[PDB]
Write a protein that binds this ligand. Sequence first.
Ligand SMILES: Cc1cc2nc3c(=O)[nH]c(=O)nc-3n(C[C@H](O)[C@H](O)[C@H](O)COP(=O)(O)OP(=O)(O)OC[C@H]3O[C@@H](n4cnc5c(N)ncnc54)[C@H](O)[C@@H]3O)c2cc1C
Ligand SMILES: Cc1cc2nc3c(=O)[nH]c(=O)nc-3n(C[C@H](O)[C@H](O)[C@H](O)COP(=O)(O)OP(=O)(O)OC[C@H]3O[C@@H](n4cnc5c(N)ncnc54)[C@H](O)[C@@H]3O)c2cc1C
Ligand SMILES: O=C(O)Cc1ccco1
Ligand SMILES: O=C(O)Cc1ccco1
Lengths: 381, 388
Amino acid sequence: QSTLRRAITAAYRRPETECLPPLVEAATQSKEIRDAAASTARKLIEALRGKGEQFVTGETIREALKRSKELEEKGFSYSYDMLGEAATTAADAERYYRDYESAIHAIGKASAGRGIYEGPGISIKLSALHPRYSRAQAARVMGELLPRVKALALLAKNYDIGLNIDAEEADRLELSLDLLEVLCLDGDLSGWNGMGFVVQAYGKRCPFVLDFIIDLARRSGRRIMVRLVKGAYWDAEIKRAQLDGLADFPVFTRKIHTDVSYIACAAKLLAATDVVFPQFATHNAQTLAAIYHMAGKDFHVGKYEFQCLHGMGEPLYEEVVGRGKLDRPCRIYAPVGTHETLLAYLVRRLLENGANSSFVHRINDPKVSIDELIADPVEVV
Amino acid sequence: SRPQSTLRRAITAAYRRPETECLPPLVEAATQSKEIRDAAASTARKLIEALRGKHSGSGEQFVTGETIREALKRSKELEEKGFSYSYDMLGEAATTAADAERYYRDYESAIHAIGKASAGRGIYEGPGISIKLSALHPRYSRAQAARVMGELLPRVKALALLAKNYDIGLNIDAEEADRLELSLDLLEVLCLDGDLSGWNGMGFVVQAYGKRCPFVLDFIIDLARRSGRRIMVRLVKGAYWDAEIKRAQLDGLADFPVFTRKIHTDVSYIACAAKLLAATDVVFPQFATHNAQTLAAIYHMAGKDFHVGKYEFQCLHGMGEPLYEEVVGRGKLDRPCRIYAPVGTHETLLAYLVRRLLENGANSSFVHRINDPKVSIDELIADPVEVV
Ligand SMILES: Cc1cc2nc3c(=O)[nH]c(=O)nc-3n(C[C@H](O)[C@H](O)[C@H](O)COP(=O)(O)OP(=O)(O)OC[C@H]3O[C@@H](n4cnc5c(N)ncnc54)[C@H](O)[C@@H]3O)c2cc1C
Ligand SMILES: Cc1cc2nc3c(=O)[nH]c(=O)nc-3n(C[C@H](O)[C@H](O)[C@H](O)COP(=O)(O)OP(=O)(O)OC[C@H]3O[C@@H](n4cnc5c(N)ncnc54)[C@H](O)[C@@H]3O)c2cc1C
Ligand SMILES: O=C(O)Cc1ccco1
Ligand SMILES: O=C(O)Cc1ccco1
């Protein structure tokens, strides 16, 4: 219970028309920045337009770790995800826990003291770790989940690697956020800045979650890693919201509004790089160019990074990483597992890649001009 | 008693009957002689070895055209080889009354176009259409059966009357388990409607992953006898398995309306195929599958006597043509195959494509196992009935 937590609850289903004015103002860039971003985005898109096995990095963490050397030398880093989610039995949640535990040991040993920015890390889904994650009361779920996540966080602290909590459906944002707060106030994890958390910009609550996390970082002394994404579950959220007869949804219903929300939330994160580590996860060259110029000329490893999904982001970020390009780092999200554990992730990649509104679809669409692809969302909204 | 009391009571009783209680009758009905099993194994081995190597050892490929005119032009090649077509104007789960009206006009336009292209070839050799009832009512899964039926029935009857006037097939696709009962009641009213007399093009899908499947087939076969219609029956395994599992979990069910072990669906399919093959005087079985072992089993179960119109196989565009190029035609198995042909753009491909990904990407699917290095040809041709 706090003023910052109340802003989150109040925004849950705020009407879309009332959410946007503060985002538009925050996402408005100076003419100089807009012109520079348009130039960079054009260069990236011209390069791209000259360019489920593809989505999985390896079957095992040993296999995926071996395959990461080539791109790590080019300026990429990795976040490994042992595939698995939505556990329905205690046995499944225990197996996912042991998968994550063994991955941390292997990743942490491979990190070899490179630390949380230059070395690899791990991503986890809370729904893999509790057999009734979405069907039981949030209070009891968090309490049974807490010792498992704390144990994993303690292992990540032992090796000094990143451990990110992925974001899933909207009705579990609050639970996962409460877990993040308990961990960041837990003295057994002091001195480790590897805890990471995803916030989804297609959510109406996003900037208020970001206010809460930035303040939590500042008062806890933890430099929380914050992965800003647009979001992967849009079709399911819409279908659930429609089934519930809800007049106002927890997510935006126009893609341009999510784009404006992302840029507005990026501005908020870039103003807080003292206390959080922003991670800008996107495959959209206009979004990337905007953030690249919003961040200014000062850069050091550990200030911020970009991120991308394995099999989707490499052609864009080959134009970004390295000293002959933009000299900014990118962390590749690397799924690890069998084809069967991959299926649910694959479905969301199909919804992402196949949507006519998606950047990665439009980049191949002969009816979509480069002019349209470099359009600034605020000037279009 | 209430009309068809016993048949209707059997369907309701099976709805959520324990899986272990459903299987013994299906296994016995699915049992075939050793001679037939050896012959089917040899046929299945031949089909798989031909599959690979005509295709080097191995989602626009699922759509036949953006418009029905474009799709009909593209059908000429495979029709010349002896395939037929069932066109589906992509669209489902209408959320508005206006959307339901748009889908109805798409189906209506398509029947005129398909009927002209058919040019009197009839329901077996000529093309037909498939429809989804969820496209035609704006709250199909949410509204009371009274309201849905009373509004849906005139629209489906109007479409059936058009299909009768051109003598083409009109198939009702099967969707989620909770709409089986409504769709079956609609089938009954249409088959008893005298305005549709003399046309045998009405078709209906039954999903063998459902516990009700054999009792639904008993009801349909009896309906064909008392109505005098030869009902076209498409036997499938089922496309919504992942969604059905999730829905039953959220409904708090102790027992699901579908099987949870994949080989149980295989046994159910073969047992239901045996029931259909014994009733070809009053139904037209349509065996929809991409599984070469299932195909071979039904090919040998059906015996040596065949004529076009007895039964057919079916496949999805973009999935089944390589298998059935080893089936259609005098030098192959000399059995016909109807290709299900989606028609539309990306504004309508979505829901169907997700179900294709779940089908193609599942470790348990034949189309995935045929490319899996861990699966021997021995396993691909194994009779599932022998495993249980
Ligand atoms: C490294 C990485 C990690 C990620 N982690 C997560 C995670 O933990 N949880 C999560 O949910 N997502 C996560 N995502 C995001 C998700 O997987 C997609 O990759 C991302 O949303 C695509 O955005 P884009 O900027 O690349 O592309 P764009 O094409 O610019 O944006 C597409 C996005 O717009 C949104 N959208 C589409 N249509 C509409 C509409 N009508 N109304 C409103 N919004 C709409 C959706 O969010 C969609 O994904 C992650 C992405 C990356 C790269
Ligand atoms: C022409 C045609 C029309 C079709 N029409 C419809 C329709 O109207 N409605 C519909 O629902 N389906 C329909 N289908 C079926 C669906 O689209 C799939 O193509 C079909 O189920 C795949 O079965 P298969 O015999 O080709 O493959 P197989 O690999 O032999 O069987 C796979 C099937 O097994 C089932 N299954 C998978 N895992 C399990 C499990 N753990 N427990 C139990 N069962 C399991 C599922 O039904 C899955 O699709 C149609 C198929 C075709 C070819
Ligand atoms: O799982 C998803 O589809 C979204 C996502 C990508 C990386 C982490 O989460
Ligand atoms: O729509 C689905 O996925 C199942 C299906 C295939 C053909 C008719 O229905």
